[PDB]
């Protein structure tokens, strides 16, 4: 459950993300593919080489998916019902894979925003990704 403190911490970090969204989302998607080879079986139709416009197009997408949930920290279920339809109902992704990408997103944010990535902001960002995962992996429609 997100604390009022958490919501504040989150928005501030994404204020600081700025237009740097999609590159982190891509890097992240990259960290998870090389770091956890099984998560590539989720992408049999994607190109995977370091270049991979397809990765970048998906990184940009995942990022704004994120950005969207940030502006709706008070009702995500209604907010991301669409991605739930994809991940929960259609793809039936094993929640563990969210923990992996989640962690890899933090691996990146920590990497490019050292000063912003404090111990306190990490808690809030970790719980945030965790709540994004629950919605995406729960079926509620």
């Amino acid at each position: 459950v997100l604390s009022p403190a958490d919501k504040t911490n989150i928005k501030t970090a994404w204020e600081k993300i700025g237009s740097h969204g999609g590159e982190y989302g891509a890097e992240a998607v990259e960290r998870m593919f090389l770091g956890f080879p099984t998560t590539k079986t989720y992408f049999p139709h994607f190109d995977f080489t370091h270049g991979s416009e397809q990765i970048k197009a998906h990184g940009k997408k995942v990022s704004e998916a994120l950005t969207k949930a940030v502006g709706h920290l008070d009702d995500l279920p209604g907010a991301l019902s669409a991605l739930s339809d994809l991940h929960a109902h259609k793809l039936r992704v094993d929640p563990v894979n969210f923990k992996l990408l989640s962690h890899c997103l933090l691996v990146t944010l920590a990497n490019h925003h050292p000063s912003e990535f404090t111990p306190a902001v990490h808690a809030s960002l970790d719980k945030f990704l965790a709540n994004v995962s629950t919605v995406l992996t729960s079926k509620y429609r």
Binding site: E27, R31, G35, H103, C104
Partner: peptide
């Protein structure tokens, strides 16, 4: 521990070094 390594080393901690560590 992996995050922390990332935090300390930035771009040096490349995807490929993230794998070897994972």
């Amino acid at each position: 521990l992996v995050i922390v390594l990332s935090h300390h080393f930035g771009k040096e901690f490349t995807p490929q070094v993230q794998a070897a560590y994972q």
